[PDB]
Nucleic acid binder design. Structure first.
Lengths: 633, 623
DNA sequence: TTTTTTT
């Protein structure tokens, strides 16, 4: 029934090699042993988990090859049976565990106090897993291959079971954290002795009968009582990773795959971001009754080892490099959509929105949003959609949306228990709306509920803090000078006031402009790079945006007085400019607020500790250019 | 000695530390731990706080004794015992209960006041520690925190019905008619293998009888995580709080409650019949103490002095939103609504309702919803809603299967209701609100479940003008865009419009710039004004008098000359009773009715409103 | 149960 098959691997010698590697391996190339230092941290309880790097094992095997000693191929044997090798790794960690350099606070650890007492009363008494307070993990092998190469859900195969492997795909959902009894401790009063049971299955049958030798000697039939303070418990969480849309074949739906995340690895993931997680693919045993029907067919799962989501001194150095390159605001603006030619003012406004303004909350309770919102109004074929998609790609958490593609309620929060909508997915990001003119005013009301106050009201509520961007075509598909600017915008004055700035661009034939645009476009076609200033990398651009946001500049007396004078001037200019052809909308105290946020964003981009009158004038100039683009005609 | 298991600390030592806290621990120790020696009083400090508390429990006749972890920390040995409690809250709580009972017996003997030691023994003293730790949400709670004392604040999503608890099993032998009672420990009954009576000589003859079995009161209350504790991106996780005996039903659902307790984790059976239990353990918090989140004599004296001041009406208006500018009339109407009119019930004509509902319309940047959030903060019970987020069914009642659930307006009942984007609010929701406001109560009929829920809520509404900015040419009622039935239902209608002048712009810009100029920037304190409204309702019950009746009849006839709804006259009477509460006048007066009519005239800018069609000139608004 | 949407 059990035909033994000798295989070209010996677990004893492999574990001896693992224990040797734990003590010998050190980050000398990066520079006691590094693994020994991690073990000492775990002994101090400063480290609650262990992660064994497959690249470290490969480097140790290469060192053994240089020494001439034959490598046990530990890195490859991990790919062979990582689940089996993990127990040997834990045993080697127990063997090579240093004494705690720092006190473990054993008195606070009721389990430790009771463990000393139980050993004294007893004088593998308790499970080694119960003795261990750390969780093993495996770092994916460095590229130089199943673990190193990420896989899709459909790409994964049943042969990959028992093997460490990395996967790529959208996280469909994450199960709520639940306790997991790694070891259940049973206690019986009749014996006075504790009996431990180690649970390694999805479900367990309680002992329900005292196994204590004291109860056996007394002949009493004791009723075991589980103790939460004595039984080991570990957080258990599940994740559903679904295949990336590119990985999905045409005409096929991506498949979500359940993943088991336990211990310190629990709660690490968020559904919004794509994750590249290396984990030992393993079968999921069926229950008894369901397995009787399933037969040889078996369920499967993945136990994550190393989790990585796509999206300091180095960041500070990069920001300093951008500052040394200089003119950072205009440089980032030109870096936005380098393939697109022109629209530098729109790019600068987009960069200001990306940096955002300072969010202010008064002591009395008033809260003024610091997030900036922008709108783009342009004739067809002016790269409105292209610029919006480029901005969405620039935003790590931003979401691109279309007015016809998604309902306003669905974008704010799509009803199926509530689930986050496109705006919630745009939390700490920028929600982009393509063809915003086509979007219905009914959904625009839902957008207006959130633009003025970040929170969403439905009951269920979410903070929904984000920056709003909109791209709209002018009424009848193109701008009409006979139509007023407000008529061509075709938007509510509430929307205009909630928006910090709206940009109007017109398509006017021009020989030199056509020649320059054709030159840039032909250069882009013949060579993917734009002809010409070098755009900053998107990672450094996002880092600079975060560094600007960290500044949080405050207004000064001179800047505030100048902004008040500008507010009076704008109100008077609206009172005199009731002519619809020249009227862009009445002056707004809230708009001066939006102006305050834009000045704060400019001072953030300049990294000024306080807002500057130059920043306020630059924001006013952005609005002035928004009007002057139409004035030029 | 007797020691709690795994603690290496004597249970007798814990009881002795609790006894040293109960007696031979001065209130001066707690006052010194609080410091603030100028605030502390030497005589009460010299008196023993816990001795006085045990004597107060004896005077009350109740075994339960409220406990302060701060006072436990104040006494030194009791602080050591409180740390031992933080390690083992349930065991130390039982020890402190026994210590409170023993100290009560000793205190009865010492005071020589009449009492029964047998009555103290029959009583089971309760220790209810509080301030053991900072309040935390259920999502913040952890399995390591399980079986450790903690203080938690949470808003009750709902309170479950009282659950019977098997305090003691009772065994009655069917074979031999034997009667027995078996105490229930750890929630498990004990059954002898053989008959309790040797003469019966029947194995397993004893049979449990549920009615004979003793039952202790028990209850659970669902508790949402506190709004600050909840993540900004997701709704709070909720954990029900176990409660029993006096702690059961301590706080009603829908009101914030702070319950100190020890977190508990219990195995969950894989099947109810099967002995197997899932490795995951369901988590719940058993509350050692239950607490919320009435005017003190000094607060009532302060409220009386304020009400004596003639400036106090405008002072409370400004105090509602001290930082806000230029909406003092709307705030005064809101303060009158918070005071509320008096309610009268009669066999004929139904019951006139004193609660006042206020509708406010303001052009964008009116700070109307800033003032509305200020009113929500000022209200003892606050309900805030957005018109886009408001739903009629959610406002009236919901059904879960099939039992009716409280509506948003019903939850607002017992407090002021705040509505933002009221112009954006659906006209169908306003139609649902019309009947509820006219009746001051909600009646719901539906398939399967038909029931009425109380909706006696003062209602404040912040509304956009129908035009994006308020138009003087537009009628004020049309700009508010409220349906006429709902406008009649509302006791007050408020109209606010921005007025532009160079000096006024200088003033407004100076206010905003001053708040900005501070790095962090007559008004009663908001809590003191909430207490003043509560004291006004408690000690002032205004009723229509002869002078107020002359004013009311004159106002009704004059408004009919100007058409007057009979509900508006009742609303004016409610606002007059509200004004008497604002003035702390026991009965409505002609000045109160005159102020109520003046408040309504000022609220809607009726004095500003042009005589024809109800439109208001913009210059007339803001005088 | 509650959207969603096709009949």
């Amino acid at each position: 029934a059990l035909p033994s098959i000798q295989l070209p691997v010996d677990y004893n010698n492999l574990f001896n090699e693992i224990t040797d590697f734990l003590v010998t391996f050190k980050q000398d190339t990066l520079s006691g042993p590094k693994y020994m230092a991690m073990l000492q941290k775990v002994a101090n309880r400063e480290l609650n988990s262990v992660i064994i790097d497959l690249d470290d094992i490969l480097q140790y095997q290469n060192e053994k090859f240089l020494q001439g000693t034959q490598a046990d191929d530990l890195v490859s044997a991990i790919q062979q049976n990582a689940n089996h090798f993990t127990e040997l790794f834990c045993r080697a960690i127990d063997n090579n565990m240093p004494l705690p350099t720092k006190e473990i606070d054993y008195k606070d650890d009721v389990l430790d106090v009771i463990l000393n007492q139980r050993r004294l009363r007893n004088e593998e008494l308790f499970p080694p897993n119960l003795t261990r307070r750390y969780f093993l993990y495996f770092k994916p092998l460095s590229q130089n291959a199943i673990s190193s190469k990420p896989l899709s859900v459909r790409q994964i195969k049943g042969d990959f079971l028992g093997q460490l492997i990395t996967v790529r795909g959208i996280i469909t959902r994450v199960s709520d954290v639940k306790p997991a009894v790694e070891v259940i401790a049973y206690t019986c009063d009749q014996c006075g002795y504790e009996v431990f049971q180690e649970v390694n299955s999805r479900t367990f049958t309680p002992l329900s009968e005292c196994t204590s030798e004291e109860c056996s000697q007394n002949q009493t039939k004791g009723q075991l009582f589980m103790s939460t303070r004595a039984s080991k418990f570990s957080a258990f969480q599940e994740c559903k990773i679904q295949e990336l849309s590119q990985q999905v074949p045409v005409g096929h739906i991506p498949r979500s795959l359940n993943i088991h995340v336990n211990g310190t690895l629990v709660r690490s993931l968020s559904p919004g971001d794509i994750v590249d997680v290396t984990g030992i693919f393993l079968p999921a045993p069926y229950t008894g009754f369901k397995a009787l029907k399933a037969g040889l067919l078996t369920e499967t799962y993945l136990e994550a080892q190393f989790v990585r989501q796509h999206k300091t001194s180095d960041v500070e150095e990069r920001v300093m490099e951008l500052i040394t390159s200089g003119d950072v605001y205009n440089r980032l603006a030109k870096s936005i959509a380098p393939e697109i030619y022109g629209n530098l003012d729109v790019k600068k406004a987009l960069l200001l929105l990306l940096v955002g303004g300072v969010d202010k909350r008064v002591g009395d309770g008033m809260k003024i949003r610091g997030d900036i919102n922008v709108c783009l109004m342009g004739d067809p074929g002016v790269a409105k959609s292209q610029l919006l998609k480029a901005i969405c790609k620039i935003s790590p958490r931003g979401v691109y949306t279309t007015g016809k593609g998604s309902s306003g309620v669905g974008l704010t929060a799509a009803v199926m228990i509530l689930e986050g909508g496109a705006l919630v997915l745009a939390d700490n990001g920028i929600c982009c709306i393509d063809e915003f003119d086509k979007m219905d005013e009914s959904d625009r009301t839902a957008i207006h509920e959130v633009m003025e106050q970040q929170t969403i009201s439905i009951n269920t509520t979410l903070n929904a803090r984000t920056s709003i961007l909109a791209a709209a075509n002018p009424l009848y598909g193109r701008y009409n000078p006979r139509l007023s600017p407000l008529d061509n915008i075709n938007l509510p004055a509430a929307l205009l006031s909630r928006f910090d700035i709206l940009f109007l661009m017109l398509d006017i034939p021009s020989r030199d402009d056509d020649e320059k645009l054709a030159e840039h476009v032909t250069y882009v076609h013949m060579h993917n790079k734009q002809p010409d200033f070098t755009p900053v990398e998107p990672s450094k651009m996002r880092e600079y945006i975060a560094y600007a946001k960290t500044k949080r500049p405050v207004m000064s007396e001179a800047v505030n007085d100048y902004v008040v004078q500008a507010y009076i001037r704008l109100r008077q200019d609206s009172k005199r400019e009731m002519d619809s052809k020249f009227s862009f909308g009445q002056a707004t105290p809230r708009t001066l607020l939006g102006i305050i946020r834009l000045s704060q964003a400019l001072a953030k981009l300049r990294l000024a500790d306080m807002v500057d009158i130059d920043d306020v004038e630059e924001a006013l100039r952005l609005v002035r250019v928004s009007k002057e683009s139409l004035y030029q005609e | 000695l007797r020691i709690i298991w795994g603690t290496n600390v004597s249970i007798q030592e814990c009881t002795t530390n609790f006894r040293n806290f109960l007696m031979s621990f001065k209130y001066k120790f707690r006052k010194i731990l609080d410091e603030r020696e100028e605030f502390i009083n030497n005589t009460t400090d010299e008196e023993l706080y816990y001795i006085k508390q045990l004597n107060e429990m004896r005077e009350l006749g109740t075994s339960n004794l409220n406990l302060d972890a701060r006072n436990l920390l104040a006494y030194k040995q009791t602080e050591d015992l409180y740390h031992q409690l933080l390690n083992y809250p349930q065991e130390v709580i039982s020890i402190m209960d026994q210590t409170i009972k023993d100290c009560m017996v000793s205190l009865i003997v010492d005071n020589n006041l009449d009492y029964d030691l047998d009555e103290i023994e029959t009583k089971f003293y309760k220790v209810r520690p509080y301030n053991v730790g900072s309040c935390k949400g259920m999502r913040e709670l952890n399995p390591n925190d399980i079986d450790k004392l903690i203080n938690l604040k949470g808003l009750v999503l709902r309170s479950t019905p009282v659950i019977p608890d098997m305090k003691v099993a009772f065994f009655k032998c069917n074979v031999c008619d034997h009667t027995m009672a078996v105490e229930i420990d750890r929630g498990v009954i004990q059954e002898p293998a053989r008959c309790e009576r040797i003469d019966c000589n029947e194995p397993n003859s004893m049979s449990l009888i549920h009615n004979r079995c003793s039952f202790a009161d028990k209850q659970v209350i669902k508790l949402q995580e506190t709004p600050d504790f909840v993540p900004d991106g997701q709704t709070p996780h909720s954990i029900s709080l176990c409660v029993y005996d006096e702690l059961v039903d301590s706080c009603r659902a829908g009101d914030r409650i702070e319950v100190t307790g020890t977190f508990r984790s219990i195995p969950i059976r894989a099947n109810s019949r099967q002995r197997v239990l899932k490795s995951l353990y369901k988590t719940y918090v058993d509350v050692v103490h239950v607490k919320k989140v009435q005017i003190t004599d000094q607060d009532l004296a302060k409220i009386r002095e304020v009400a004596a001041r003639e400036d106090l009406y405008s002072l409370l208006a400004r105090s509602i939103a001290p930082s806000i500018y230029e909406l003092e009339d709307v705030k005064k109407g809101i303060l009158l609504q918070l005071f509320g009119g008096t309610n009268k019930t009669f066999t004929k004509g139904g019951r006139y309702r004193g609660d006042i509902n206020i509708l406010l319309c303001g052009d964008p940047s009116t700070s109307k919803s800033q003032i509305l959030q200020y009113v929500h903060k000022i209200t003892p019970r606050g309900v805030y809603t957005s018109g886009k987020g408001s739903s009629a069914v959610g406002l009236t009642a919901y059904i879960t299967r099939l039992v009716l659930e409280s509506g948003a307006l019903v939850l607002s009942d017992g407090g002021v209701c705040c509505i933002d984007e009221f112009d954006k609010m659906s006209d169908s929701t306003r139609s649902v609100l019309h009947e509820v406001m006219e009746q001051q109560t909600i009646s719901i009929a539906k398939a399967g479940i038909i029931t009425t829920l109380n909706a006696r809520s003062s209602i404040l509404a912040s509304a956009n003008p129908i035009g994006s900015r308020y138009n003087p040419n537009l009628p004020v009622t049309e700009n508010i865009d409220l349906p006429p039935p709902l406008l009649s239902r509302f006791d007050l209608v408020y109209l606010v419009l921005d007025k532009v002048d160079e000096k006024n712009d200088r003033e407004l810009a100076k206010h905003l710039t001053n708040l900005y100029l501070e790095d962090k920037p007559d008004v009663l304190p908001v809590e003191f004004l909430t207490m003043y409204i509560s004291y006004a309702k408690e000690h002032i019950h205004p009723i229509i008098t002869e002078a107020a009746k002359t004013e009311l009849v004159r106002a009704y006839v004059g408004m009919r000359k100007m058409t007057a709804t009979t509900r508006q006259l009742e609303s004016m009477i409610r606002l007059a009773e509200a004004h008497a509460k604002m003035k702390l006048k026991n009965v409505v007066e002609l000045e109160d009715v005159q102020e109520a009519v003046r408040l309504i005239r000022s609220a809607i800018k009726d004095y500003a409103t042009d005589p024809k069609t109800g439109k208001i000139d913009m210059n007339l608004v803001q005088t």
